[PDB]
Write a protein that binds this ligand. Structure first.
Ligand SMILES: CO[C@@H]1O[C@H](CO)[C@H](O)[C@H](OC(=O)c2ccc(C)cc2)[C@@H]1OC(=O)c1ccccc1[N+](=O)[O-]
Ligand SMILES: [Cl-]
Length: 138
């Protein structure tokens, strides 16, 4: 078990066939989770489950450039449950991040930040107990 917020270094950034696995349990009164794939201060890929946005559950994805949030991509398919263990897998492909939760495909997010080899940190934060965060080459 790790202390959140947690920074996972991604040395030399990400590359196609890099599979990032995040294992954790959602806290019982969860409001939000965030994965932030960072290129310095920019967020190439913000993955943000929201448990209570207007009494709905939604996943918000976005990019932050020069400290400005861009256009949101939203997904109502919401595989997280308060109190339950999850696995998030982010598979880097040539043109998008592919996200599967609990071995079920969830969403794709097209690369807005092009410099994948400079996306050198993943921030993990929010209402989770973090069990592990790691990556491998498939
Ligand atoms: C102004 O809205 C932004 O949309 C951005 C993407 O487009 C980011 O999701 C932003 O999240 C943050 O940057 C953020 C929020 C809180 C903390 C502690 C750290 C970062 C932020 O999101 C929120 O603050 C937010 C708004 C409504 C419901 C739930 C949340 N939320 O889960 O924080
Ligand atoms: Cl870029």
């Amino acid at each position: 078990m790790l202390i959140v917020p947690y920074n996972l270094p991604l040395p030399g950034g990400v590359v196609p066939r890099m599979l990032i696995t995040i294992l954790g349990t959602v806290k019982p009164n969860a409001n939000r989770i965030a994965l932030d794939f960072q290129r310095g201060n920019d967020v190439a890929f913000h993955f943000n489950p929201r448990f209570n946005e207007n009494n709905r559950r939604v996943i918000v994805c976005n990019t932050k450039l020069d400290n400005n949030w861009g256009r949101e991509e939203r997904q109502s398919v919401f595989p997280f449950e308060s109190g339950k263990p999850f696995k998030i897998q982010v598979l880097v492909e040539p043109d998008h991040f592919k996200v599967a939760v609990n071995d079920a495909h969830l969403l794709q997010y097209n690369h807005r930040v092009k410099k994948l080899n400079e996306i050198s940190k993943l921030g993990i934060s929010g209402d989770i107990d973090l069990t592990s965060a790691s990556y491998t080459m498939i």
